DNA sequence: ATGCATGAGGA
DNA sequence: CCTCATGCAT
DNA sequence: ATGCATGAGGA
DNA sequence: CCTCATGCAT
């Protein structure tokens, strides 16, 4: 049976609180999941978990693995600023542009088409985090 | 004879440009200064150098050491947001408060006195960077 | 890329 | 205390 | 703490 | 192409 979104908030809040009190960094925890359970994770992922900056499914996948570490540790190419806001505006107009709208947006802002395609992919995926940028 | 501030801007701009083209990260360069010259530096320091976020003296100290690497590589406790703006306001009023103004500022914002003393130390020291936050 | 930190050295 | 060079952790 | 990225897997 | 989990580099 799955946690609620409230369960994950409170778990993340208490996980961070306890990780600090034990004297571990985010990078430490991520490495220890590799050491103890053969499933390493980066500082970036532990940080996002604590901020709920991951999808609900991802949050649910990591929670028991982080609960394991907690139980166990208790025992011891750059978009300009002006261009960035332009990408926003079109994202509210339409957040999933075609490969044709992307390729034209890339010239009107003088970005490579791949840069724009990936930027939209990422901005769509932040919208799906449990705590999105809004 | 010492570089001008313009010399250091252009050197930092060209250093970053060349470091990327060689395929090295900031952390790589910092470690290589230890490897090659027995003077290791952190990713943080290389990053600040490229952004001129260090004092003129510091910038001058690091430049020849980074010019060495370039020549050689060519061959191969958290202040709330609202509280933060309050610390600013008083910094313009007076940027070097006494240990008595510090200790009272610490209670009126419910921070530890050491936190406020260190915050002022750091905010004074950013004012001395070649590219300050302003 | 940066917030908060440390410690050597000095008035 | 401070300045100052410097970095861990995020 | 996060901007830009990759690659496995799927419609 | 996309979604999605994930991280290097800053």
Residue A3 per-residue DSSP state: P
| Secondary structure (DSSP) of B22-80 | HT--HHHHHHHHHHHHS----HHHHHHHHTT-S-HHHHHHHHHHHHHHHHHHTT-----
CA B102 and chain centroid, separation: 24
Residue B16 in contact with residue B25, Cβ under 8 Å? no
As a rounded value in angstroms, the CA-to-C1' distance for A1 and C2 is 41
Q: How was this structure determined?
A: X-ray
Nucleotide nearest to B62 (CA to C1'): D5
Torsions phi, psi of A38, nearest 5?
60, 25
Question: If we measure between CA atoms, which residue out of A16, A7, A112, A4 comes closest to residue A66?
Answer: A16
Proximity of residue A104 CB to strand E below 7 A: no
d(CA A126, CA A41): 19
Question: Who contacts A123 (Cβ-Cβ below 8 Å, separation ≥6)?
Answer: A87, A91, A95
- DSSP line for B69-132: HHHHHTT-----HHHHHHHHHHHHH-SS--HHHHHHHHHHTT--HHHHHHHHHHHHHHTTSSS-
The interaxial angle of helices A5-22 and A43-50, nearest 10 deg, is 120
Question: Residue A87: which residues within 8 A CB-CB, separation 6 or more?
Answer: A79, A105, A109, A116, A119, A120, A123
Write out the two tokens for B8: 């250091």
DSSP string, A45-84: HHHHHHTT-S-HHHHHHHHHHHHHHHHHHTT-----HHHH
CA distance B134 to B132: 5
Q: In angstroms, rounded to a whole number, what is the distance separating the alpha carbons of residues A98 and B112?
A: 54
Query: Within 7 Å: CB of A5 and strand F?
Result: no
Q: How far is the CA of B8 from the C1' of D6 (A)?
A: 19
**Closest-CA residue to B7 (of B127, B130, B129, B125):** B130
């Amino acid at each position: 049976d799955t946690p609620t979104s409230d369960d994950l908030e409170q778990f993340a809040k208490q996980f961070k609180q306890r990780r600090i009190k034990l004297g571990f960094t985010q990078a430490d925890v991520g490495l220890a999941l590799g050491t103890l359970y053969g499933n390493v994770f980066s500082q970036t992922t532990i940080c996002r978990f604590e901020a709920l900056q991951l999808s609900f499914k991802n949050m649910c996948k990591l929670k028991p693995l982080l609960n394991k570490w907690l139980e166990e540790a208790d025992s011891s190419t750059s978009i300009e600023v002006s261009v960035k806001g332009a990408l926003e505006s079109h994202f509210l107009k339409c957040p999933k542009p075609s490969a044709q709208e992307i390729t034209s947006l890339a010239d009107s802002l003088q970005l490579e088409k791949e840069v724009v395609r990936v930027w939209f992919c990422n901005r769509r995926q932040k919208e799906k985090r449990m705590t999105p940028p809004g």
